[PDB]
Amino acid sequence: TSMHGVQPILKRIRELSQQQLDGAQVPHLQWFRDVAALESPAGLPLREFPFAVYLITGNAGSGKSTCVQTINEVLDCVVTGATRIAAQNMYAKLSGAFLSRPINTIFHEFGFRGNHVQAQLGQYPYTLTSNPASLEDLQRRDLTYYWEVILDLTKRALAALRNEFRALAALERTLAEGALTRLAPATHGALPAFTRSNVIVIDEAGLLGRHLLTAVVYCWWMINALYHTPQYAARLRPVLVCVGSPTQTAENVLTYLICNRTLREYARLSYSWAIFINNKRCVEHEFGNLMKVLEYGLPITEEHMQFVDRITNPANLPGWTRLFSSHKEVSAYMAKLHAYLKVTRVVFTLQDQDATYVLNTLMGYTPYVVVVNYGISSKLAMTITRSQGLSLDKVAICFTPGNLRLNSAYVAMSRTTSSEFLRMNLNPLRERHERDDVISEHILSALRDPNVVIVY
Amino acid sequence: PVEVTALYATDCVITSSIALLTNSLGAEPVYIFSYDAYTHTEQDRFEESRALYQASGGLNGDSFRVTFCLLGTEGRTRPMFVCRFERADDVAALQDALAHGTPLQPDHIAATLDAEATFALHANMILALTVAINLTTLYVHHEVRVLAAYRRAYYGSAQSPFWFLSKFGPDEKSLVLTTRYYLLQAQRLTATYDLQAIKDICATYAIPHAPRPDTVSATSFAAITRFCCTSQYARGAAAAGFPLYVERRIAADVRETSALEKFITHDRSCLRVSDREFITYIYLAHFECFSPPRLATHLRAVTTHDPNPAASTEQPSPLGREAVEQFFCHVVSFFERKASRNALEHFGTLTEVLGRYNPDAGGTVEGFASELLGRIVACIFVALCVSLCID
Ligand SMILES: Cc1cccc(C)c1N(CC(=O)Nc1ccc(-c2ncon2)cc1)C(=O)C1CCS(=O)(=O)CC1
């Protein structure tokens, strides 16, 4: 029954997406000009891009997908994902409940394209001269770190008369007032959806770069300023709904928002943060209590340990996936599974993995593998870094000593629904393991904050 | 002048509507899938809504103003055109359409169309499309662009009946009441909730069910109008009292949830305890406030058996009072010796299983030890549920 803890969320987001900024505070087209043609980040003028943030945190299967449905059913917003798989997942989830629009990636919107994918980011230095954390300097260094794509996007936007809204505003002035420009997006479909609403709901926002929040705000204000959209005219500010799991989804938007000292004050997370502690994935006593420990940084006892006391060779393990640590190990396991099965006496062989196909649904082919034609994804094993954000039920983890983290253990062990389909190797718990107490301590301190709301 | 907001359906909807408003060709018979009824205390509302409908006949009104709306945001529904059925033949046709389910022929829509408001709510978009190119009878020159403009304006205007059946539940009551309420009365009347909330509220709206005289079930838009309109749920006491029950249930759940949440937050922001005990407290309070037995008890307390609010078979919610006996934390921790106890009654020892096996001194100590099965070695500290320092 999470349908009544969501109405405070609705109230807070609607309140935060309605406040109007001041004229001297909103960005103006002149700021984007002379910076579009600017060559080096060193010439970036100190300018503020106001924005608002609402955060949904939790663990996979916590009801974090129903809040997005509610937002995209009662509030005007653009649902957006860090990847195409996430966008498709929430499209299936929400289009199974009500009307849905094609959920485009953060790459489709924001102007990002294929040429923008490859860029020598980070080759521009930045020294934080002032008091360690300030909005001006942080935004400027986020733009500096991500300068190539920002520069190309500004050049493409301003170079490529944009009277779609101004012509209607002129007619309203001649006559109607602030009512005809609201139908402009429904007349010209070419417009980015960032023009239609200031709220951009982001799922799995913890996979996006620490530098990328400011870039999105920058390019959103860009489209709002060139097009002269009514939300920009009435001085509305971005309200991005970042939904993700900082403890699982891995220097990132979630960590930047929770851990930074001054973003916790400007964005006022305490009044705009919800914590979800439910877990529909695992529903059993022991495993549930261990995930707890692994997420909240609880001390390791001698019961949760021993609980984990109750793979490399595919000889007898049919129908399981293996979560290797390094990419080289995954390539080696591709070189082994497609070689041992050659003489198994459901495969027989024939780019994302090493190569050779396994017929377990990859059953037939003709070429047209059953299609744009022969590039498919092999899910038989995949790396722990990419393991997050997916849903599997046949995991077989393959930790290695020396580089054994608990966050990775953590990510790789909760991918399955039931612990019966769980197989492993030399145990992550015990031994020598590195811990990141910052995020767990921040989450615990948030849980001890009366201002935030918690929903099961 | 009884106001009747109606979400119609066609066999494309946008093309049919544009043709119907313009001068006619593309006019397909419209299907009134959901229809509203309102005129300008809770008991007074119930009696007014029940008298506006009729147990035997349809809507009791000499004059009818019928606003026609499609799906989209101007708002879940957006008015598409407005018609007034005042003539006796028009009133008879509206009565036969809203109750029996007969589709409205294009001639009736054209004759009863009120040009004033119908074109006053669209002249804005006509001017917008005119500006884009640089009444709407001039769309012959630019037609596909106008079609696309109204597709983008009314998102969800063209939908399949399978969509409606999947979204608004497979049951009769769920379909009619959730569809009508959620799509029209939520905006008309507070209860801006999700479709799941409305479906769950209608699920516990256990009014007396009576089998239909014939046994039929919903292919294409040829049957769903007759399936929904003639149902006993869309008329009389059920329709009159459904919004009232939704409001009452929402208020009850909100008040209980707020009462629980006050204590939950207060006895959470004041604990000077360890993090483990804090997490135990959180997961103990959420169980004490949302246990499946307690949730079922609350649902059976808030459910009603009669549409009339006067009967009020709903009982006061005991969830908060039941939580009182546990939320006595005025001060093996008290949170542990509850959590474990709690978990035992809802989940499932070495000594008993060892007694069942009577491996410490038996022959089975070597039945799995020396049998390495070819994995790894340190043998009979690379310790050996084998190869430790698996699941
Ligand atoms: C909390 C609750 C409320 C109502 C009904 C029930 C069934 C429960 N649950 C289920 C539960 O806690 N699930 C869960 C599992 C893992 C995670 C997670 N994932 C990653 O990190 N953490 C989060 C939630 C319990 O377990 C009770 C049992 C008695 S109790 O122990 O006294 C209180 C908790």
Side-chain angles (χ1 to χ4, degrees), chain A residues 311-342 347 349 352-358 360 378-383 394-398 425:
Chain A
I311 305 89
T312 311
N313 300 0
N316 188 359
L317 300 89
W320 303 62
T321 188
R322 280 75 179 272
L323 295 170
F324 282 81
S325 299
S326 70
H327 181 74
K328 181 200 166 186
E329 294 166 316
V330 186
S331 88
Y333 175 67
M334 294 298 103
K336 189 174 185 179
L337 182 63
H338 287 112
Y340 152 68
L341 278 195
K342 272 179 179 178
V347 60
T349 80
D352 61 357
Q353 274 76 59
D354 198 296
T356 50
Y357 292 165
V358 63
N360 296 115
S378 190
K379 197 138 169 182
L380 276 296
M382 65 179 288
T383 187
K394 51 181 173 70
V395 298
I397 300 168
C398 186
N425 295 115

Coordinates of all heavy atoms in Angstrom, one line a residue, chain A residues 311-342 347 349 352-358 360 378-383 394-398 425:
Chain A
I311 N 31.4 -23.3 -11.4 CA 31.3 -21.8 -11.7 C 32.2 -21.5 -12.9 O 31.8 -21.1 -13.9 CB 31.6 -21.0 -10.5 CG1 30.7 -21.4 -9.3 CG2 31.4 -19.5 -10.8 CD1 31.3 -22.5 -8.4
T312 N 33.5 -21.5 -12.6 CA 34.5 -21.3 -13.7 C 34.4 -22.3 -14.8 O 34.4 -22.0 -16.0 CB 35.9 -21.2 -13.1 OG1 35.9 -20.4 -12.0 CG2 36.9 -20.7 -14.1
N313 N 34.2 -23.6 -14.4 CA 34.0 -24.7 -15.4 C 32.5 -24.9 -15.7 O 31.7 -25.1 -14.8 CB 34.7 -25.9 -14.8 CG 36.1 -25.8 -14.6 OD1 36.7 -24.7 -14.8 ND2 36.8 -26.9 -14.1
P314 N 32.2 -24.8 -17.0 CA 30.7 -25.0 -17.3 C 30.3 -26.4 -17.4 O 29.2 -26.7 -17.9 CB 30.6 -24.3 -18.7 CG 32.0 -24.4 -19.3 CD 32.9 -24.2 -18.1
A315 N 31.1 -27.4 -16.9 CA 30.8 -28.8 -17.1 C 29.4 -29.2 -16.7 O 28.7 -29.8 -17.5 CB 31.9 -29.6 -16.4
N316 N 29.0 -28.9 -15.5 CA 27.7 -29.2 -15.1 C 27.1 -28.0 -14.3 O 27.2 -28.0 -13.1 CB 27.6 -30.5 -14.2 CG 26.2 -31.0 -13.9 OD1 25.2 -30.3 -14.3 ND2 26.1 -32.1 -13.2
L317 N 26.6 -27.1 -15.0 CA 25.8 -26.0 -14.5 C 25.0 -25.4 -15.7 O 25.2 -24.3 -16.1 CB 26.6 -24.8 -13.9 CG 27.6 -25.0 -12.7 CD1 29.0 -25.4 -13.2 CD2 27.6 -23.7 -11.9
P318 N 24.0 -26.2 -16.2 CA 23.2 -25.7 -17.4 C 22.2 -24.6 -17.0 O 21.4 -24.7 -16.1 CB 22.5 -27.0 -17.9 CG 22.3 -27.8 -16.6 CD 23.5 -27.5 -15.7
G319 N 22.3 -23.5 -17.8 CA 21.3 -22.5 -17.7 C 21.6 -21.4 -16.6 O 20.7 -20.9 -16.0
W320 N 22.9 -21.1 -16.4 CA 23.3 -20.1 -15.4 C 24.2 -19.1 -16.0 O 24.9 -19.3 -17.0 CB 24.0 -20.8 -14.2 CG 23.2 -21.8 -13.5 CD1 22.8 -23.0 -14.0 CD2 22.8 -21.8 -12.1 NE1 22.1 -23.7 -13.0 CE2 22.0 -23.0 -11.9 CE3 22.9 -20.8 -11.1 CZ2 21.5 -23.3 -10.6 CZ3 22.3 -21.1 -9.9 CH2 21.6 -22.3 -9.7
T321 N 24.1 -17.9 -15.5 CA 25.0 -16.8 -15.9 C 26.1 -16.5 -14.8 O 25.9 -16.8 -13.6 CB 24.2 -15.5 -16.2 OG1 25.1 -14.5 -16.7 CG2 23.6 -14.9 -14.9
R322 N 27.3 -16.1 -15.3 CA 28.4 -15.9 -14.4 C 28.8 -14.4 -14.4 O 29.0 -13.8 -15.5 CB 29.6 -16.8 -14.8 CG 29.5 -18.2 -14.4 CD 28.4 -19.0 -15.2 NE 28.3 -20.4 -14.8 CZ 29.1 -21.4 -15.2 NH1 30.0 -21.2 -16.1 NH2 28.9 -22.6 -14.8
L323 N 29.0 -13.8 -13.2 CA 29.4 -12.4 -13.1 C 30.8 -12.3 -12.8 O 31.2 -12.3 -11.6 CB 28.5 -11.8 -12.1 CG 27.0 -11.7 -12.4 CD1 26.2 -11.2 -11.2 CD2 26.7 -10.7 -13.6
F324 N 31.7 -12.3 -13.8 CA 33.1 -12.2 -13.6 C 33.5 -10.8 -13.2 O 32.7 -9.8 -13.4 CB 33.9 -12.6 -14.9 CG 34.0 -14.1 -15.1 CD1 32.9 -14.8 -15.6 CD2 35.1 -14.8 -14.7 CE1 33.0 -16.2 -15.8 CE2 35.2 -16.2 -14.9 CZ 34.1 -16.9 -15.4
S325 N 34.7 -10.7 -12.6 CA 35.1 -9.4 -12.1 C 35.6 -8.5 -13.2 O 35.1 -7.4 -13.5 CB 36.2 -9.6 -11.1 OG 35.8 -10.3 -10.0
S326 N 36.7 -8.9 -14.0 CA 37.3 -8.1 -15.0 C 36.8 -8.5 -16.4 O 36.3 -9.6 -16.6 CB 38.8 -8.2 -14.9 OG 39.3 -9.5 -15.3
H327 N 36.9 -7.6 -17.3 CA 36.5 -7.9 -18.7 C 37.3 -9.0 -19.4 O 36.8 -9.8 -20.2 CB 36.5 -6.6 -19.5 CG 36.1 -6.8 -20.9 ND1 34.7 -6.9 -21.3 CD2 36.7 -6.8 -22.1 CE1 34.6 -7.0 -22.6 NE2 35.8 -7.0 -23.1
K328 N 38.6 -9.1 -19.0 CA 39.4 -10.1 -19.5 C 38.9 -11.5 -19.1 O 39.0 -12.4 -19.9 CB 40.9 -9.9 -19.1 CG 41.9 -10.9 -19.6 CD 43.1 -11.0 -18.8 CE 43.9 -12.2 -19.1 NZ 45.1 -12.4 -18.2
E329 N 38.5 -11.6 -17.9 CA 37.9 -12.9 -17.4 C 36.6 -13.2 -18.2 O 36.4 -14.4 -18.5 CB 37.6 -12.8 -15.9 CG 38.9 -12.7 -15.1 CD 38.6 -12.3 -13.6 OE1 37.8 -11.4 -13.4 OE2 39.2 -12.8 -12.7
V330 N 35.8 -12.2 -18.5 CA 34.6 -12.5 -19.3 C 35.0 -13.0 -20.7 O 34.4 -13.9 -21.2 CB 33.7 -11.2 -19.4 CG1 32.4 -11.5 -20.1 CG2 33.4 -10.7 -18.0
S331 N 36.0 -12.3 -21.3 CA 36.5 -12.8 -22.6 C 37.0 -14.2 -22.6 O 36.8 -15.0 -23.5 CB 37.5 -11.8 -23.1 OG 38.8 -12.2 -22.7
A332 N 37.8 -14.5 -21.5 CA 38.3 -15.9 -21.3 C 37.1 -16.9 -21.2 O 37.2 -18.0 -21.7 CB 39.2 -15.9 -20.1
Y333 N 36.1 -16.5 -20.4 CA 35.0 -17.4 -20.3 C 34.2 -17.6 -21.6 O 33.7 -18.7 -21.9 CB 34.0 -17.0 -19.1 CG 32.8 -17.9 -19.0 CD1 32.9 -19.2 -18.6 CD2 31.5 -17.4 -19.3 CE1 31.8 -20.0 -18.5 CE2 30.4 -18.2 -19.2 CZ 30.6 -19.5 -18.7 OH 29.5 -20.3 -18.6
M334 N 34.1 -16.6 -22.4 CA 33.6 -16.7 -23.7 C 34.5 -17.6 -24.6 O 33.9 -18.4 -25.4 CB 33.4 -15.4 -24.4 CG 32.4 -14.5 -23.8 SD 30.7 -15.2 -23.8 CE 30.5 -15.8 -22.1
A335 N 35.8 -17.5 -24.5 CA 36.7 -18.4 -25.2 C 36.6 -19.8 -24.7 O 37.0 -20.8 -25.4 CB 38.1 -17.9 -25.1
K336 N 36.2 -20.1 -23.5 CA 36.1 -21.4 -22.9 C 34.7 -22.0 -23.1 O 34.7 -23.2 -23.5 CB 36.4 -21.3 -21.4 CG 36.5 -22.7 -20.7 CD 37.0 -22.5 -19.3 CE 37.3 -23.8 -18.6 NZ 37.7 -23.7 -17.2
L337 N 33.6 -21.3 -22.9 CA 32.3 -21.9 -23.1 C 32.0 -22.2 -24.6 O 31.3 -23.2 -24.9 CB 31.2 -20.9 -22.6 CG 29.8 -21.4 -22.7 CD1 29.6 -22.6 -21.8 CD2 28.8 -20.2 -22.2
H338 N 32.6 -21.4 -25.5 CA 32.4 -21.7 -26.9 C 33.4 -22.6 -27.5 O 33.5 -22.8 -28.7 CB 32.4 -20.4 -27.7 CG 31.2 -19.5 -27.5 ND1 31.2 -18.3 -26.8 CD2 29.9 -19.7 -27.9 CE1 29.9 -17.8 -26.8 NE2 29.1 -18.7 -27.5
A339 N 34.3 -23.2 -26.6 CA 35.3 -24.2 -27.1 C 35.0 -25.5 -26.5 O 35.1 -26.6 -27.1 CB 36.7 -23.7 -26.7
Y340 N 34.6 -25.6 -25.2 CA 34.2 -26.8 -24.5 C 32.9 -27.4 -25.1 O 32.8 -28.6 -25.3 CB 34.1 -26.6 -23.0 CG 33.1 -27.5 -22.3 CD1 33.4 -28.9 -22.2 CD2 32.0 -27.0 -21.8 CE1 32.5 -29.7 -21.6 CE2 31.1 -27.9 -21.2 CZ 31.3 -29.2 -21.1 OH 30.4 -30.1 -20.4
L341 N 32.0 -26.5 -25.4 CA 30.7 -26.9 -26.0 C 30.8 -27.3 -27.4 O 29.9 -27.9 -28.0 CB 29.7 -25.8 -25.8 CG 29.0 -25.7 -24.5 CD1 27.7 -24.8 -24.6 CD2 28.6 -27.1 -23.9
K342 N 32.0 -27.0 -28.1 CA 32.2 -27.5 -29.4 C 32.2 -29.0 -29.6 O 31.7 -29.6 -30.6 CB 33.5 -26.9 -30.0 CG 33.3 -25.5 -30.6 CD 34.6 -25.0 -31.1 CE 34.5 -23.6 -31.8 NZ 35.8 -23.0 -32.2
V347 N 24.3 -25.7 -29.4 CA 25.4 -24.7 -29.5 C 26.1 -24.9 -30.9 O 25.5 -24.3 -31.8 CB 26.4 -24.9 -28.3 CG1 27.0 -26.4 -28.2 CG2 27.5 -23.9 -28.3
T349 N 28.4 -23.5 -32.2 CA 29.0 -22.2 -32.7 C 28.6 -21.8 -34.1 O 27.7 -22.5 -34.7 CB 30.5 -22.2 -32.5 OG1 31.1 -22.9 -33.6 CG2 30.9 -22.9 -31.2
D352 N 30.1 -7.8 -28.7 CA 30.2 -7.3 -27.3 C 30.9 -8.3 -26.4 O 31.5 -7.8 -25.4 CB 28.8 -7.0 -26.8 CG 27.9 -8.2 -26.8 OD1 28.3 -9.3 -27.2 OD2 26.7 -8.1 -26.3
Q353 N 30.9 -9.6 -26.7 CA 31.7 -10.5 -26.0 C 32.8 -11.2 -26.9 O 32.8 -10.9 -28.1 CB 30.8 -11.6 -25.4 CG 30.2 -11.3 -24.0 CD 29.1 -10.3 -24.1 OE1 28.1 -10.5 -24.8 NE2 29.2 -9.1 -23.5
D354 N 33.6 -12.0 -26.3 CA 34.7 -12.6 -27.1 C 34.1 -13.7 -28.0 O 33.1 -14.3 -27.7 CB 35.7 -13.2 -26.2 CG 37.1 -13.5 -26.9 OD1 37.1 -14.4 -27.8 OD2 38.1 -12.9 -26.5
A355 N 34.8 -14.0 -29.1 CA 34.4 -15.0 -30.1 C 35.5 -15.8 -30.6 O 36.3 -16.4 -29.8 CB 33.6 -14.3 -31.2
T356 N 31.3 -16.9 -32.5 CA 30.9 -18.1 -31.8 C 29.6 -17.8 -31.0 O 29.6 -17.0 -30.1 CB 31.9 -18.7 -30.9 OG1 32.5 -17.7 -30.1 CG2 33.1 -19.3 -31.8
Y357 N 28.5 -18.6 -31.3 CA 27.3 -18.4 -30.6 C 26.9 -19.7 -29.9 O 27.4 -20.8 -30.3 CB 26.1 -18.0 -31.6 CG 26.3 -16.6 -32.2 CD1 25.5 -16.3 -33.3 CD2 27.1 -15.7 -31.7 CE1 25.6 -15.0 -33.9 CE2 27.3 -14.4 -32.2 CZ 26.5 -14.1 -33.3 OH 26.6 -12.9 -33.9
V358 N 26.1 -19.6 -28.9 CA 25.6 -20.7 -28.1 C 24.1 -20.7 -28.3 O 23.4 -19.7 -28.1 CB 26.0 -20.7 -26.6 CG1 25.4 -19.5 -25.9 CG2 25.6 -22.0 -25.9
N360 N 21.6 -21.7 -26.5 CA 21.0 -21.9 -25.2 C 21.2 -23.4 -24.7 O 21.2 -23.6 -23.5 CB 19.5 -21.6 -25.2 CG 19.3 -20.1 -25.5 OD1 18.7 -19.8 -26.5 ND2 19.7 -19.3 -24.6
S378 N 25.0 -11.6 -25.9 CA 25.1 -12.9 -25.2 C 25.0 -12.6 -23.7 O 25.9 -12.0 -23.1 CB 26.4 -13.6 -25.5 OG 26.3 -15.0 -25.1
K379 N 24.0 -13.1 -23.1 CA 23.7 -12.9 -21.6 C 24.3 -14.0 -20.7 O 24.1 -14.0 -19.5 CB 22.2 -12.7 -21.4 CG 21.8 -12.1 -20.1 CD 20.7 -11.1 -20.3 CE 20.0 -10.6 -19.0 NZ 18.9 -9.7 -19.2
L380 N 25.0 -15.0 -21.3 CA 25.5 -16.1 -20.6 C 26.4 -15.8 -19.5 O 26.5 -16.5 -18.5 CB 26.2 -17.1 -21.6 CG 25.3 -18.1 -22.3 CD1 24.6 -19.0 -21.3 CD2 24.2 -17.4 -23.2
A381 N 27.2 -14.7 -19.6 CA 28.0 -14.2 -18.6 C 28.2 -12.7 -18.8 O 28.3 -12.3 -20.0 CB 29.4 -14.9 -18.4
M382 N 28.4 -11.9 -17.8 CA 28.5 -10.5 -18.0 C 29.2 -9.9 -16.7 O 29.1 -10.5 -15.6 CB 27.2 -9.8 -18.3 CG 26.2 -9.8 -17.1 SD 24.6 -9.0 -17.5 CE 25.1 -7.3 -17.5
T383 N 29.8 -8.7 -16.9 CA 30.7 -8.2 -15.9 C 30.0 -7.5 -14.7 O 28.8 -7.1 -14.9 CB 31.8 -7.2 -16.5 OG1 32.7 -6.8 -15.5 CG2 31.1 -5.9 -17.0
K394 N 19.7 -16.4 -12.7 CA 20.7 -17.5 -12.9 C 22.1 -17.1 -12.6 O 23.0 -17.6 -13.3 CB 20.5 -18.1 -14.2 CG 20.6 -17.1 -15.4 CD 20.4 -17.8 -16.7 CE 20.3 -16.7 -17.8 NZ 21.6 -16.0 -18.1
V395 N 22.3 -16.2 -11.6 CA 23.6 -15.6 -11.4 C 24.6 -16.6 -10.7 O 24.1 -17.5 -9.9 CB 23.5 -14.4 -10.5 CG1 22.6 -13.3 -11.2 CG2 22.9 -14.7 -9.2
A396 N 25.9 -16.6 -11.1 CA 26.9 -17.4 -10.5 C 28.2 -16.5 -10.4 O 28.9 -16.3 -11.3 CB 27.2 -18.6 -11.3
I397 N 28.3 -15.9 -9.2 CA 29.3 -14.8 -9.1 C 30.7 -15.5 -9.0 O 30.9 -16.6 -8.5 CB 29.0 -14.0 -7.8 CG1 27.7 -13.3 -7.9 CG2 30.0 -12.9 -7.7 CD1 27.2 -12.7 -6.6
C398 N 31.7 -14.7 -9.5 CA 33.1 -15.2 -9.6 C 34.1 -14.2 -9.1 O 35.0 -13.7 -9.8 CB 33.4 -15.5 -11.1 SG 35.0 -16.3 -11.4
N425 N 31.8 -18.3 -5.3 CA 33.1 -18.8 -5.1 C 33.6 -18.4 -3.7 O 32.8 -18.1 -2.8 CB 34.0 -18.4 -6.2 CG 33.6 -18.9 -7.6 OD1 33.2 -18.1 -8.5 ND2 33.8 -20.2 -7.8

